Amino acid sequence: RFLKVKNWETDVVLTDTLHLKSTLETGCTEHICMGSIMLPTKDQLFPLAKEFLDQYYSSIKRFGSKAHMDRLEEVNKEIESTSTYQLKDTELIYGAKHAWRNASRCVGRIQWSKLQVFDARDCTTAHGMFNYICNHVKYATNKGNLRSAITIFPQRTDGKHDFRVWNSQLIRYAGYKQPDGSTLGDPANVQFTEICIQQGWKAPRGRFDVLPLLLQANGNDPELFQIPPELVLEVPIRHPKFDWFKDLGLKWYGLPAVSNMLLEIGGLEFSACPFSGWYMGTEIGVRDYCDNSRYNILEEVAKKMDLDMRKTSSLWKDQALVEINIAVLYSFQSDKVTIVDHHSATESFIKHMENEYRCRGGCPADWVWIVPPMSGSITPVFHQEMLNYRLTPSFEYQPDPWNTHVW
Amino acid sequence: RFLKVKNWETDVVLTDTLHLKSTLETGCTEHICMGSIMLPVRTKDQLFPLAKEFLDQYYSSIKRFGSKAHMDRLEEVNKEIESTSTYQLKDTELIYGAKHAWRNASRCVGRIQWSKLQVFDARDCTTAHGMFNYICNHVKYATNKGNLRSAITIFPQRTDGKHDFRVWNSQLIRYAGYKQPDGSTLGDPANVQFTEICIQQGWKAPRGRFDVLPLLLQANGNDPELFQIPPELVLEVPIRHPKFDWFKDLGLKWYGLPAVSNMLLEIGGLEFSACPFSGWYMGTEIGVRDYCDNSRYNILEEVAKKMDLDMRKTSSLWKDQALVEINIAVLYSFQSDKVTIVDHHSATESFIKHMENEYRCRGGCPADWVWIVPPMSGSITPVFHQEMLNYRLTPSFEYQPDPWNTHVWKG
Ligand code: HEM
Ligand code: HEM
Numbered sequence: 082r083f084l085k086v087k088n089w090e091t092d093v094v095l096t097d098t099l100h101l102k103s104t105l106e107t108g109c110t111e112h113i114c115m116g117s118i119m120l121p122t123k124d125q126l127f128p129l130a131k132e133f134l135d136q137y138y139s140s141i142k143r144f145g146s147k148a149h150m151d152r153l154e155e156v157n158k159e160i161e162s163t164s165t166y167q168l169k170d171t172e173l174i175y176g177a178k179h180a181w182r183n184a185s186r187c188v189g190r191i192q193w194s195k196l197q198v199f200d201a202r203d204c205t206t207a208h209g210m211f212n213y214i215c216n217h218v219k220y221a222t223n224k225g226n227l228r229s230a231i232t233i234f235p236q237r238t239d240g241k242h243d244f245r246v247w248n249s250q251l252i253r254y255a256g257y258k259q260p261d262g263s264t265l266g267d268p269a270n271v272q273f274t275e276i277c278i279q280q281g282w283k284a285p286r287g288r289f290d291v292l293p294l295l296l297q298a299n300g301n302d303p304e305l306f307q308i309p310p311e312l313v314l315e316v317p318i319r320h321p322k323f324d325w326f327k328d329l330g331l332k333w334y335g336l337p338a339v340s341n342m343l344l345e346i347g348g349l350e351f352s353a354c355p356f357s358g359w360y361m362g363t364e365i366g367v368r369d370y371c372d373n374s375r376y377n378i379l380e381e382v383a384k385k386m387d388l389d390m391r392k393t394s395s396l397w398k399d400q401a402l403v404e405i406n407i408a409v410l411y412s413f414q415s416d417k418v419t420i421v422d423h424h425s426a427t428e429s430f431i432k433h434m435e436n437e438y439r440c441r442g443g444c445p446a447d448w449v450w451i452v453p454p455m456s457g458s459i460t461p462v463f464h465q466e467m468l469n470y471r472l473t474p475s476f477e478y479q480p481d482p483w484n485t486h487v488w
Numbered sequence: 489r490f491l492k493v494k495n496w497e498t499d500v501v502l503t504d505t506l507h508l509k510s511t512l513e514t515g516c517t518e519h520i521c522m523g524s525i526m527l528p529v530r531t532k533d534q535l536f537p538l539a540k541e542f543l544d545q546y547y548s549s550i551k552r553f554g555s556k557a558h559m560d561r562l563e564e565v566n567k568e569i570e571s572t573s574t575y576q577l578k579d580t581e582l583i584y585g586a587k588h589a590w591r592n593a594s595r596c597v598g599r600i601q602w603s604k605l606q607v608f609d610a611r612d613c614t615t616a617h618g619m620f621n622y623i624c625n626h627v628k629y630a631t632n633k634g635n636l637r638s639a640i641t642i643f644p645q646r647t648d649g650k651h652d653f654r655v656w657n658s659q660l661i662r663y664a665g666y667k668q669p670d671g672s673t674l675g676d677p678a679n680v681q682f683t684e685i686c687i688q689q690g691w692k693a694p695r696g697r698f699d700v701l702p703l704l705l706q707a708n709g710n711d712p713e714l715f716q717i718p719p720e721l722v723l724e725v726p727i728r729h730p731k732f733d734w735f736k737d738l739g740l741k742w743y744g745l746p747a748v749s750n751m752l753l754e755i756g757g758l759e760f761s762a763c764p765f766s767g768w769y770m771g772t773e774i775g776v777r778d779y780c781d782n783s784r785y786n787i788l789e790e791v792a793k794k795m796d797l798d799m800r801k802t803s804s805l806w807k808d809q810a811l812v813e814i815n816i817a818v819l820y821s822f823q824s825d826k827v828t829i830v831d832h833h834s835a836t837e838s839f840i841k842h843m844e845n846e847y848r849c850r851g852g853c854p855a856d857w858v859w860i861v862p863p864m865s866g867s868i869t870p871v872f873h874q875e876m877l878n879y880r881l882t883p884s885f886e887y888q889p890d891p892w893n894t895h896v897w898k899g
C-alpha cells in the first residue's frame with residue numbers, strides 16, 4: 082500500500098504515499114492494464130467541495146481553523162440553497178495551479194506554481210470571450226518570451242448554458258481535402274476546418290491558414306472571430322546547415338494553447354478554460370511534422386538529403402527525423418521564441434519528481450506520455466518508474482461540442 | 489465483456505475477447521496503474537486445475553477436445569499427481585507449452601515468429617557437465633553460422649525447490665564487467681556482480697573490454713560449476729560504419745546470439761527454472777541500450793566527439809544525432825557479416841501485422857506498450873500509435889530471483 086518507484090539508471094528509490102489520496106478511477110484492473118489507451122447534484126457536490134476546501138486550507142496552514150470551518154459552513158449553506166457554489170479568487174487560483182500539478186501526462190509540471198490565472202467568470206457573450214482570449218494570447222506570447230496562463234470562463238450550471246471554445250487550440254492550422262483525394266494543410270483539423278466553413282469562414286485554402294475562433298457563450302450558438310494576425314507569433318523553419326531547408330516552406334506557431342479541456346475544481350466544472358505554456362521541440366518536429374496522419378514530411382526531407390530510402394535498415398527516417406527536430410529548435414531559438422528540447426524538459430521533470438516526492442509524498446505520472454516520441458532511452462524519464470493515478474483538481478477531456486449542441 | 493483497441497494512425501479498431509481467459513494479476517488496480525514498473529514448492533491442491541486448464545487448451549488446439557485421448561490424459565495426470573505430487577508432460581505438450589509461453593509474452597515484439605521454435609528436451613539432464621553439453625549444442629544449432637534459428641533448451645522441472653536446475657548467467661553469451669579501484673568500470677557494467685561471482689568461483693579473467701563470460705551452471709540443487717563455451721561457437725561481429733571509417737577504431741564488437749538464460753517457464757503449473765532460449769537481435773537492443781545507456785557502454789560522448797558535433801548545448805541534439813549513426817553501424821555490420829538482425833521499423837511493422845492476425849484467429853494479443861515501443865524513434869514506428877491491452881496468460885515466461893540470493897551452499 083506504500084509504493085516504491087525505482088530509477089533504473091540511478092538506482093534512486095522514491096516512496097509514494099500520495100496515491101492513497103486518489104479519488105477517481107484508472108480504467109485498469111488486477112486483470113488488465115489499460116495504460117496505453119488514449120481515453121480510458123447537491124449530495125454529489127458537497128463532499129467534493131469539502132475535499133477541496135480541506136486541501137486548500139491545509140495548503141495554507143489553517144487546517145481546522147474557524148476560517149476553514151466558517152468557509153465549509155458558508156459553501157455548504159450555499160450548495161443547499163443554490164444547488165451550486167462559487168469559488169473565492171484564492172481558491173480558483175489554487176485550484177487551477179493544482180489541476181496542472183496533477184496532470185500526470187505533463188512533462189512540464191516543474192513550472193506548475195508560476196501560472197497566471199485570468200478570472201473570466203464575469204463573461205457573458207462570445208465577443209466578451211474573444212476579448213478575453215486575445216488578451217490571454219497577447220499576455221502569454223509576451224513578444225516570444227512565453228509566460229504560462231489560463232483563462233477561466235463561467236462554470237457549468239444546468240449543462241444547457243455551457244461556455245465552450247470549439248477549437249482544440251487557440252492557434253491551429255486549417256485542413257482541407259483535395260479533389261485528388263489528398264489533404265492540404267493539417268489533416269487533424271479537417272472536420273473542424275469544415276465546421277468553420279459551414280458557419281461562414283472564408284478559407285485562403287492554404288497550407289498554413291490560422292483557423293478562426295469558434296466561441297460559445299451561455300449555451301448559445303458559437304460565433305466566428307479572427308485572432309488579430311499581429312497577436313499570432315509564428316516561426317519560419319530553417320536548418321543551421323541545410324540552406325535548402327527553408328524552401329520546404331514550413332512554419333509553426335509559438336503558442337501552444339489548449340482550449341478544449343474541462344477544468345474541475347471542488348466539484349465545479351469549467352468547460353471553457355483555455356490554457357497555454359510553451360512547446361517542447363518534439364511536439365512540432367516529431368509529432369506535427371512527421372506523424373503519418375499529420376504533415377507527414379519525412380519522405381520530402383529524406384529526398385532533399387538524398388538518403389538511401391530503398392531499405393528501412395538504412396535508418397533514413399531516423400536520420401531525417403533528427404535533422405527536422407534540429408531545425409525546429411534552431412528556428413525558435415534564433416527568433417527568440419521560448420522552446421525547450423526533450424533532453425532539457427525530461428531532465429527538469431526528474432528534478433520535479435524529486436521535489437514532489439519529497440514535499441508532497443508523490444507525483445502521478447503517465448510514463449507512456451512523459452517519454453518523448455524520439456530518442457526515448459537517452460532521456461532520463463525512460464529509466465524512471467512512474468505511478469499513474471488520478472488526483473483532483475484536474476483537467477479532463479470532454480466531447481467535441483458539435484456532437485452535443487442543440488442548435 | 490468485449491474490449492476495443494484503436495490504432496490512431498489508421499483508425500483500425502479491434503475487439504479483444506481473449507483477455508477473459510486471463511487468471512493471473514497485473515499489478516494494477518482501479519486506483520493505480522503500475523504499467524511502467526519493471527518488476528511486478530506448490531501443492532497438489534492448487535496443481536490439478538492448472539494441469540486441467542493447460543491440457544484443455546492443448547487438446548482444443550489439436551482439435552481433440554472432449555475426445556477419449558483427452559479424457560484419458562486428464563485421468564492419467566490426475567492420478568500421477570495425487571500419487572507423486574507432480575506430473576510429466578508429453579513431448580507434444582512440452583513443445584506446445586514452450587511455443588505458447590513465447591506467444592503470450594506481452595513484452596516481446598518478435599512474436600510473429602512464435603510457432604517456429606526449436607524445442608530441445610533436456611529433461612533427462614542430471615549434472616552441470618550434462619548442462620554444458622546441452623547448452624553448447626543449443627548455441628551451435630541456433631547460431632547456424634549466422635543464419636539464426638529460434639530455439640529453447642528445457643531442463644528438468646522444479647520438484648521440492650531444493651533441487652532446482654539453474655543457469656546463473658542472465659544470458660548464455662555476455663561480456664564481463666570489472667569495477668576498478670578508481671571507481672570506473674571496465675567492460676559491461678551490467679555484469680559486474682556476476683563477473684565477481686565467476687571470478688570468485690575460480691574464473692581467470694582476461695580483464696578486457698569484451699570478455700565472453702564463462703557459464704556458471706547449477707544442476708539438481710547442487711553448487712554451480714564453471715565452464716567455458718568453445719570460442720569457435722561464439723559468433724561475434726566487429727562494428728563498423730558504412731561512411732565513417734574511424735568508427736572501426738572505436739574498438740566495438742558484439743556477440744550475435746541473444747540467449748536469455750535466467751527466466752522461468754511455467755507450463756500447466758509445472759516450473760522450469762532452467763530454460764534458456766534464443767532468437768536474434770533487434771538492432772536497437774545493441775545500438776541504443778547496450779551501447780548508449782548511461783549505465784552500460786555509454787559511447788555517446790566518444791562517438792559525438794569523433795563526428796565533431798556541437799556538444800556544448802543539448803538543443804543541438806548531438807546525442808540524438810550520434811545515437812542514429814551508432815544504430816546504423818550496428819545494422820550495417822551484422823548485414824555485412826551475414827548475421828541475422830532486424831531493424832526497429834521492420835520489427836514493429838511485422839508485430840502490428842502479427843497482432844492484427846492474433847485478434848482474428850485468437851481474439852486478442854496481450855502486449856506491453858512500454859516495452860514494445862523501441863527506445864529510439866518511437867512515434868515513427870507504427871506501434872507507438874497502437875493501443876494495446878496488457879494481461880497475463882499461461883503458459884508464460886516469468887522472472888525469478890537471482891540464484892545467488894537464494895542458493896543454499898553445500899561447500
Ligand atoms: C510551460 C511549459 C509546458 C510544457 C513544456 C509542457 C509539456 C507538455 C507536453 C509535451 C505534453 C504532451 C502533449 C502531447 O503530447 O499532446 C503535455 C501535456 C499536458 N499538459 Fe503540459 N506543458 C507545459 C505547460 C502546461 C500548462 C500551463 C498546463 C495547464 C495549466 C499544462 C497541462 C497539460 C495537460 C492537462 C496535459 C495532458 C494533455 C492531454 O491529455 O492531451 N501544461 N504537456
Ligand atoms: C526471433 C527474434 C526475436 C526478436 C527480434 C525479439 C525481440 C524482443 C525484444 C527487442 C525484446 C525486449 C527485450 C529488452 O528490451 O530487454 C523482447 C522481449 C522478450 N522476448 Fe522476444 N524476440 C525474439 C524472439 C524471442 C524468443 C525465441 C523468445 C522465447 C521463446 C522470446 C521471448 C521474450 C520474452 C519472454 C521477453 C520479455 C523480456 C523480459 O521480460 O525480460 N523472444 N523480445
Ligand SMILES: Cc1cc(CCNCc2ccc3ccc(N)nc3c2)ccc1C#N
Pocket residue numbers: 119120337339357358359360361364
Ligand atoms: C483525444 C486526443 C488527445 C490528444 C492530446 C493533445 N494534447 C495536446 C496538449 C495539451 C497540453 C499541452 C501543454 C503544453 C504543451 N507544450 N503542449 C500541450 C499539448 C491528441 C489527440 C487526441 C485525439 N484524437
Ligand SMILES: Cc1cc(CCNCc2ccc3ccc(N)nc3c2)ccc1C#N
Pocket residue numbers: 089526598746748766767768769770773
Ligand atoms: C530486471 C531487468 C530485466 C530486463 C529485461 C531484459 N530482457 C532481455 C531480453 C529478453 C528476451 C529477448 C528475446 C529476444 C531478443 N532479441 N532480446 C531479448 C532480450 C533488463 C534489465 C533488468 C534489470 N535491471
Ligand SMILES: C[C@H](O)[C@H](O)[C@H]1CNc2nc(N)[nH]c(=O)c2N1
Pocket residue numbers: 116117118119449450451496872873874875876
Ligand atoms: C496508443 C498510445 O496510447 C498513443 O499513441 C499515445 C502514446 N503516447 C503519447 N504521448 C504523448 N505525449 N502524446 C500522445 O499523443 C501520445 N499518444
Ligand SMILES: C[C@H](O)[C@H](O)[C@H]1CNc2nc(N)[nH]c(=O)c2N1
Pocket residue numbers: 089463464465466467523524525526858859860
Ligand atoms: C522504468 C521502465 O518501465 C523501464 O525503463 C522499461 C521501459 N521500457 C523498456 N522496454 C524495453 N524493451 N526494455 C526495457 O528494459 C525497458 N525498460
Ligand SMILES: [Zn+2]
Pocket residue numbers: 109110113114115116516520521522523
Ligand atoms: Zn495499468
